[PDB]
């Protein structure tokens, strides 16, 4: 079990070296388009880029570049798009991505402001009466409503492709108390948020991949995707002991660099997957306990 692994790791206390090891083994593939001079103002961090092979291409003639990747989990049969927090010049690209890729959900794990700094553009309308038009990629976006909980909010957004006037509804799941380079307050509130995204239908192979972002699209997003895929993998077979957590993080880092930013986020992933296995293994009663524990209202 991952659970025995956990206990070994904790008792020796070697999370850092374990994480060190993941970092040393992770793949390294080129990011030449991300590094082209034209794309400088499209990347938020110099040292966080999409790999060329897995990047998302915009369906524009101009410049198809966005800092986003498709994480395509073959065995689990689930994909996500991981991306950075949109910059002020790329919010139009971000929604073009959502449109072209046919996503139904956007999972945001950061606040706009963190640690004194602007981690992300305000890329969605905070009120119904004030829509956003993105003239560059010709899209319009309206808040339809939202559902504010103590640690998270769910918005319903209407996205319109102005050119054809086709519209779609996007669900936005905003986790607002997961610290940059930190962990959730607990596995319970993490799982509570994750199962809310799952319940909503957005992960569900009739839609495009869910878009997951934090500020860089690697630390908080990798943690979220790692726990989700681990639980999925375990569901298809009903076999916890077939899931190798480190190795699934390593399959994911084939598609985007840097997924999971610290050893305690790695450690939090084992906690999350070990708690969530109770639900996958057929005690659905823990779901309701997570919700209590989480203090959602
Ligand atoms: O938002 C996250 O969870 C995340 O991965 N962020 C990251 S990863 C990363 C940075 C940041 C940041 O927010 O400043 C700054 C550059 O180094 C790597």
Swiss-Prot record:
It catalyses: O-phospho-L-tyrosyl-[protein] + H2O = L-tyrosyl-[protein] + phosphate. Residues 2-276 form the Tyrosine-protein phosphatase domain. The modification Phosphoserine is found at residues 49, 241-242. The modification Phosphotyrosine is found at residues 19, 65. The modification Cysteine sulfenic acid (-SOH) is found at residue 214. It is an enzyme of class 3 (hydrolase). The modification Cysteine persulfide is found at residue 214. Expressed in keratinocytes (at protein level). The modification S-nitrosocysteine is found at residue 214. It comes from the Eukaryota. It is found in: Endoplasmic reticulum membrane. Keywords: Acetylation, Endoplasmic reticulum, Hydrolase, Membrane, Oxidation, Phosphoprotein, Protein phosphatase, S-nitrosylation. Interacts with EPHA3 (phosphorylated); dephosphorylates EPHA3 and may regulate its trafficking and function. Interacts with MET. Interacts with NCK1. This is Tyrosine-protein phosphatase non-receptor type 1. It comes from Homo sapiens. The gene is PTPN1.
């Amino acid at each position: 079990e991952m659970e025995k692994e956990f206990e070994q790791i904790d008792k020796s206390g070697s999370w850092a070296a374990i994480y060190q090891d993941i970092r040393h083994e992770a793949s390294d593939f080129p990011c030449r388009v991300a590094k082209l001079p034209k794309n400088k103002n499209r990347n938020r961090y110099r040292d966080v880029s999409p790999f060329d092979h897995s990047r998302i291409k915009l369906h524009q003639e101009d410049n198809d570049y966005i800092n986003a990747s498709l994480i395509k989990m073959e065995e689990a049969q689930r994909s996500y798009i991981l991306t950075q927090g949109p910059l002020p010049n790329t919010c139009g690209h971000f929604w073009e991505m959502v449109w072209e890729q046919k996503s139904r959900g956007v999972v945001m794990l950061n606040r706009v402001m963190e640690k004194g700094s602007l981690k992300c553009a305000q890329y969605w309308p905070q009120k119904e009466e004030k829509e956003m038009i993105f003239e560059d990629t010709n899209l319009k976006l309206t808040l339809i409503s939202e559902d504010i909980k103590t640690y998270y909010t769910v918005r319903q957004l209407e996205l319109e492709n102005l050119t054809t006037q086709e519209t779609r509804e996007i669900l936005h799941f905003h986790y607002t108390t997961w610290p940059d380079f930190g962990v959730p307050e607990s596995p319970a509130s993490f799982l509570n948020f994750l199962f809310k995204v799952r319940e909503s239908g957005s992960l569900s192979p009739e839609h495009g991949p869910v878009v997951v972002h934090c500020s860089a699209g690697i630390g908080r997003s990798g943690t979220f995707c790692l726990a989700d895929t681990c639980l999925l993998l375990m569901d298809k077979r009903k076999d916890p002991s077939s899931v190798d957590i480190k190795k699934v993080l390593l399959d994911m880092r084939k598609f985007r660099m840097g997924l999971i930013q610290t050893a305690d986020q790695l450690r939090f992933s084992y906690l999350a997957v070990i708690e969530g296995a109770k639900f996958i293994m057929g005690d659905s009663s823990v779901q309701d306990q997570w919700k209590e524990l989480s203090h959602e209202d």
